């Protein structure tokens, strides 16, 4: 599909066995998602944009499918105020930006 | 031109005679560049990231080419870690994401 960019470009994806609604986010290297329990080991970062750097917790080689688009990578949990897909997930998804 | 995401977003950028480089950031609502001098007048603002709020200046109906397409809108200047731009420029130079 095609997303213009009037209004946010939110989209429902799916991880850990539940929905979310996620911002698509070419700005944003990682996938930085709201906090959640899930499983497995995972370690520590920081992650910096506008207003300084959170804490987040590393997680790898999971599954999100986005639009029913599966991809497989690096997930950053922690006090995030939304869903942001990053680069790293959206190239897998074939996503670009056109002008 | 279609942009693939493997790398950053980055675009050559000219704003006031100034020619810089920015990040098309879908996730930003705003245009956000980094400390500059621009002229006219000036309103104090503020804006949240993921690290928190910043105090920008806005600088309303400000003329910039974005790799060679001509937008007129709203730019904040403050500190940033890097310039961003953000929907209210990438949707007047006509810019979708395609996936
Ligand atoms: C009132 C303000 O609302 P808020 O709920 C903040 O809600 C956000 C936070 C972050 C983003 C993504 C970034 N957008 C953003 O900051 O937009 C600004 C500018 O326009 C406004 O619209 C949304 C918030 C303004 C941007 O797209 C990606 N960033 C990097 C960029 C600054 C270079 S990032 O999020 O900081 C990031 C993601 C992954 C990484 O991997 C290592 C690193 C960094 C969207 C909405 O309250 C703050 C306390």
Redesign the interface.
């Known amino acids: 599909?095609?997303?213009?960019?009037?209004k946010?470009?939110l989209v429902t994806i799916k991880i850990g066995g539940q929905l979310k609604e996620a911002?698509?986010?070419?700005?944003?290297?990682d996938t930085?998602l709201e906090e959640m329990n899930l499983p497995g080991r995972w370690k520590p970062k920081m992650?910096?944009?506008?207003?300084?750097?959170?804490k987040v917790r590393q997680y790898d080689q999971i599954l999100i499918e986005i639009?029913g688009?599966k991809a497989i990578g690096t997930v950053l949990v922690g006090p995030?105020?939304v869903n942001?897909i990053g680069?790293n997930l959206?190239?897998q998804?074939?996503?670009?930006?056109?002008?």
């Open positions: 599909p095609q997303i213009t960019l009037w946010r470009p911002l698509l986010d070419t700005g944003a290297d930085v992650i910096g944009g506008i207003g300084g750097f959170i639009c688009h995030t105020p942001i680069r959206l190239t998804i074939g996503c670009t930006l056109n002008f």
